[PDB]
Amino acid sequence: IVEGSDAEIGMSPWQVMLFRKSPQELLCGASLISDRWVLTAAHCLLYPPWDKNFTENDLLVRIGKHSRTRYERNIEKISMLEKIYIHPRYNWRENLDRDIALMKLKKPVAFSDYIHPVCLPDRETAASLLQAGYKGRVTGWGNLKETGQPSVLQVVNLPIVERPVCKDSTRIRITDNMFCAGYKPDEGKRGDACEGDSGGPFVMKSPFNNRWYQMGIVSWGEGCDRDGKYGFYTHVFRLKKWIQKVIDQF
């Protein structure tokens, strides 16, 4: 995260760390949506252009963390994966359309003050909250600047940006399955996600029922915190059907 601040203890109990077995390293962010399911971006697991193609046995999921590198004894829980599900129509060749993946844990994790799932939006929550100008929150242990690492989880709040503006800021063809967020050059406030943060959650707090909803998944951007550029996120509600499908069937 660029231009964010240290998170408070227990501020994002659904935040998950995707960790590589060997060499041991931070790969991406992710989120806990139930006792046995983790949501992340497909590009974190599969992206041929960068020779990336991980399987269940290649990594670990670490839940309830705050510190980036310390093994937080008696607090964090480390879990193994049983199966990975990448969206059948994930478009990694062109624009990362449908950048989404589900991961099934080998055994359920027990909740605590530091581990708790986030809600998935319903049509009404999405229709009501996904509006230009409304702010969401992004969290992660990623890079602090484009071109180092934080000591503890970082957080930043960013406004959703008008579709036309998102479109006119890049050459990439953007779809209905994505939205962009960030401050404009004239707003006098900065902030963005960066390398290591992708796959992480973009959440919003409903003012109707006071719950936190994951509206997006950090998907892609061109650089980090560059003026006139914006971070792009996977539209979780537009893809909810597939999510329920996988969970209900598997």
Binding site: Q24, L26, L60, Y71, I78
Partner: peptide, 12 residues
């Protein structure tokens, strides 16, 4: 810096 040693039980 680099990460800290996590229990062996999680690497098998």
């Amino acid at each position: 810096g680099d990460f800290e040693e996590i229990p062996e039980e999680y690497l098998q």
